[PDB]
């Protein structure tokens, strides 16, 4: 038959190995240097790297605000499904809200994506979240609106890492100039909900 | 506030547009052409259809078996997660066996990942399946073995798209080699759950 690697806990040793061994990764803190490591494992992707920003300090304040039991909220369900159950360190919560009978009628109301029209159900649990956005720039651009009233309620950090052609470059430039909370992206069309998730991943432990 | 494109469906129509302006196309048949623009279009990625193989044929096959009900097994809960309801043609199953109580036992029997082992389970909805791994590197493999059984249920298609640094290129440079059933692959380190969803989704429905 065919032969191939079968254990799974020595592939992951390998590949963080290999992307060390390739990767330009000196400008990153240690803190930064982990997360960024695991966006390239899920990505495939060795280059990446010269793509990531993040505002100071927001690693070590996600980290943080993770293990003091902030929820995580997120765009699309291919990021709330991804997110590791036994990595987080609180029992943490796990959000989508996309999917919610009210946002079909909600999204037609205020002229906008669906994407955007659930982030208004984030509300009660937003004061002192993770924000996990990986998919919609429109949800993104709408986050930045919402927090431009004194009242909304602030997330703790932002991993803004929404991917495409249109609309996705602006929305996290505007992010990393507007510097509501820490934030960090991927400048620029690359992003996703894996490279999202394996942020949130490596964030939650500090085991990688 | 900020300003950005609202319409979604808009939105849709400028990817594509912008995708068939900037991406190198010309030797892709009519049908394979749709589901790669979606490739891109999931991935932010103008470049990515540089790496993309299809076996001749898959692309009609694969559209026509869901044209008629067939399932779609997935290896991961990012992969079932991210299809479109919506676009189904025929009340088509989404199945992913991970998560089934009886797969790390399995696993350990097997010394095997829990990835590969819940591919067992497959077995009774495999016949004129749809398959989709979009992750495990493992997984595509171990269904190669299987199926050098003249015994075990064959799939009407497969979707070869793991990524990583670890078994993953090897993986489907083995299924291409191979040819068990008509299939698709993007070649090397790139891949991912995002690129594969979209593949499916592109062959379920004749709109874009
Ligand atoms: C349609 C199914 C999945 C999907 C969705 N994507 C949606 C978010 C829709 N996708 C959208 C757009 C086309 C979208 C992209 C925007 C930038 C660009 O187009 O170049 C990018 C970001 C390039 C993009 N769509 C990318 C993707 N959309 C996809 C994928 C899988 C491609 C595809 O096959 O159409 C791929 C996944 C990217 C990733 O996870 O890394 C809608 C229409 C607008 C969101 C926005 O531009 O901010 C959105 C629908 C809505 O909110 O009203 C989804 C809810 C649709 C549905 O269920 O019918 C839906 C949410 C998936 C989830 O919850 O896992
Ligand atoms: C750990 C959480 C998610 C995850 C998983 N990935 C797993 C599939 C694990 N991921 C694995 C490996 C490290 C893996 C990769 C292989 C190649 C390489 O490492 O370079 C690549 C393919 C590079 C890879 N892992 C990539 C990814 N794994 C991830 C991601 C999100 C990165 C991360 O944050 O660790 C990212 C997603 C890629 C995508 O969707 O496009 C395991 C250990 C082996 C599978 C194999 O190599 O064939 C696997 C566990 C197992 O089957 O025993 C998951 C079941 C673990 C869990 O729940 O604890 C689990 C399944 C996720 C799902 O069902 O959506």
């Known amino acids: 038959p065919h032969?191939?690697?079968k254990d799974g806990a020595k592939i992951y040793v390998q590949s963080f190995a290999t992307i060390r061994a390739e990767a330009d990764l000196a400008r990153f803190t240690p803190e930064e240097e982990v997360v960024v490591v695991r966006m390239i494992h899920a990505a495939g992707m060795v280059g990446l790297e010269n793509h990531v920003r993040f505002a100071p300090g927001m690693a070590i304040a996600?980290?943080?605000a993770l293990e003091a039991g902030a929820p995580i909220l997120c765009?699309?369900?291919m990021v709330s499904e991804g997110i590791a159950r036994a990595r987080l360190p609180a029992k943490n919560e796990v959000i989508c809200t996309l999917q919610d009978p009210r946002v079909p009628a909600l999204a037609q109301e205020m002229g906008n994506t669906?994407?955007?029209?659930?982030?208004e159900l984030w509300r009660p649990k937003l004061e002192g979240a993770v924000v996990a956005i990986g998919?919609?720039?429109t949800a993104?651009?709408?986050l930045l609106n919402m927090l431009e009233d004194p009242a909304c309620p602030r997330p703790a950090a932002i991993i803004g890492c929404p991917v495409g052609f249109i609309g996705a470059a602006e929305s996290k430039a505007a992010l990393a100039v507007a510097n509501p909370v820490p934030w960090v992206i991927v400048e620029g069309r690359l992003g996703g909900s894996?490279?999202?998730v394996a942020a949130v991943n490596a964030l939650a432990?500090?085991?990688?």
């Not at 669906?114 to 982030?119: F, I, T, V």
């Not at 432990?205 to 990688?208: D, H, T, V």
């Open 3 to 5: 032969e191939y690697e």
């Open 62 to 64: 996600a980290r943080a």
């Open 75 to 77: 765009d699309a369900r």
């Open 114 to 119: 669906r994407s955007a029209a659930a982030l």
């Open 135 to 137: 998919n919609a720039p």
């Open 140 to 142: 993104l651009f709408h």
């Open 194 to 196: 894996a490279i999202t």
């Open 205 to 208: 432990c500090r085991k990688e």
